[PDB]
Amino acid sequence: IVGGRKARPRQFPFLASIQNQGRHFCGGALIHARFVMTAASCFPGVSTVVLGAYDLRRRERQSRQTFSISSMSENGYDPQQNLNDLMLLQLDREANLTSSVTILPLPLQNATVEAGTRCQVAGWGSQRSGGRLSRFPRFVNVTVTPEDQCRPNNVCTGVLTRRGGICNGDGGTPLVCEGLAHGVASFSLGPCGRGPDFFTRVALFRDWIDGVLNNPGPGPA
Template identity: 55%
Template sequence: MDHLLALVAALWICQVNGGTFNTEIVGGREARPNSHPYIASLQFRRQHFCGGSLIAPRFLMTAAHCLSDMNPSQVTIVLGAHSLRSNEDSKQTFRITQVFENGFNPQTLRNDILILRLDRAASLNSRVKVVTLPRVNETVPAGTQCVTSGWGWLGTQSRASDLLQELNVTVTSRDLCRPNNICTGVFMRQAGICFGDSGGPLVCNGVIQGISSFIIGSCGSGVAPDFFAQVALFRNFIDGAINR
């Protein structure tokens, strides 16, 4: 799999086009408003560029590559959103006060996880909730049905949507993946994650098992699975960051 990293490197980076970030879930559907109450939008100058998940009232989990070469003090975290453009009363906005990293390697994309400490605790309610974390080293069998979510384009050549999208995916076998990742696919049609979905959640049976990390090939091509950082392998790091 490592011989494909040169191709991957051109795909996982949040690209800027005309001052806006390209984001995308291909082949998904609009989520029911606030049905993923843990999901966050990471924004730069009010433009969404990555996702994240609330794991404690004052801590957010995202992909490490999302903040590569970016000043965390310039990033805004938005919780409780469905439409990114509307003035929804469910929205809560935060700044980042501390970043915890775990040896992310930008060449191999290993350890693609960050924990962000927010400037205050989120107000938890029916539309903003903490996601359930997996047990240490918990495994997810091939064939498990999961859901991933994020904001963005409805297709590579289609219009952008400001409404949260979701996509049902299936965990693939380990021989189609690599260590420290969970891989998923959508069978019988073209669908999958893409650029601004990075950092967003992969939730299986109510537990966040993955962080959107990278793809191989074009978005939703069906040629290769989508890759997520495996959260269960980082539980000790996560707990240490929160407890610190």
């Protein structure tokens, strides 16, 4: 996150850190006891999911819960068009709901968020393209852009400062507006924070998400 503030412990207790050999590469959100929502553009082979984290470099044994990924589900992701950038990760077991691990609720199918709506985005990403990750979670206030600056598959945001928004390591992290996960961080163009940030429009996929959630398992073999 660029242009943000250091989070406090448990300020975003739904947040996931997705790791490859212990290295954070994307975020996500717990959306069900058994499932984390992230971006399809974040996928690799043999990753883990860490919930309840605060400082990436600390063990935090009494706060964290760690999981392997038993299955991944997507709905027509197209990497060329950056379309349908949404992935559900089935965890190896149900997460325990604690003061440091909670579920982030979803919008109903086709719910909208109007231009001008204030949201937040949090994550462990860098402050500049190619810079180091932040060991602590950071967060920034963002505002939904006019539709003409975006595209239907996405919810787009900007900030009033020169640079604020997502960066490397924030892919997959949720956009929270009015208490709901209205977006999944997907991409931005140009320097991090110049704007707009593009998030997958979660509300387009609610019925599909519910299908996954209600039919756990690795799918056809």
